[PDB]
Amino acid sequence: MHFFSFKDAMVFAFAPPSVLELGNATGFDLFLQDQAGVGHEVLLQARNKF
Amino acid sequence: WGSSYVNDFIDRGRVKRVYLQGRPDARMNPDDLSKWYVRNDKGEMVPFNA
């Protein structure tokens, strides 16, 4: 609450997972790709859209 | 004759090569090579058959 409520800068504070060997961070993980060679701009929008 | 590789260039997202070879018709036959002229130290243009 202290800082993620600043327009100054994001301050996302968090704890590591149960087994540190895989992560630094809990929950899920994935990658959006570019199989067409659409270029950076589309994929960047796709990230936000998503 | 021996298509020289010079550097890369991006193509639709991807690093690919840039080759530099003489025209097809200038490397077909034994006398076809006498066509290729070189530089002369004194600025002039020395032939290959020389």
From Swiss-Prot, chain A:
Superkingdom classification of source: Bacteria
Disruption phenotype: Disruption of MexA, MexB and OprM significantly reduces active efflux of N-(3-oxododecanoyl) homoserine lactone/3-oxo-C12-HSL/PAI-1, but not N-butyryl homoserine lactone/C4-HSL/PAI-2.
Protein's cellular compartments: Cell inner membrane
Induction conditions: By growth under severe iron limitation.
Subunit structure: Component of the MexAB-OprM multidrug efflux complex, composed of six MexA subunits forming a hexameric tube, binding to a MexB trimer, which interact with the trimeric OprM outer membrane channel protein. OprM is thought to not directly contact MexB; instead, MexA joins MexB and OprM by forming a funnel-like hexamer anchored to the inner membrane. MexA may initially form a hexameric ring complex with MexB prior to OprM, then OprM undergoes a conformational change as it contacts MexA, allowing the periplasmic gate to open.
Family: Belongs to the resistance-nodulation-cell division (RND) (TC 2.A.6) family.
Known role: The inner membrane transporter component of the MexAB-OprM efflux system that confers multidrug resistance. Functions as the major efflux pump for n-hexane and p-xylene efflux. Has been shown in one study to be involved in the active efflux of the autoinducer N-(3-oxododecanoyl) homoserine lactone, thereby playing an indirect role in quorum-sensing; but has been shown in another study not to be involved in efflux of this autoinducer. Over-expression of the pump increases antibiotic and solvent efflux capacities. Implicated in the secretion of the siderophore pyoverdine.
Anything else known: Pyridopyrimidine derivatives, such as ABI-PP, are not exported by the MexAB-OprM efflux pump, bind tightly to a MexB hydrophobic pocket and so potentiate the activities of antibiotics such as erythromycin.
Protein name: Multidrug resistance protein MexB
Organism ancestry: Bacteria, Pseudomonadati, Pseudomonadota, Gammaproteobacteria, Pseudomonadales
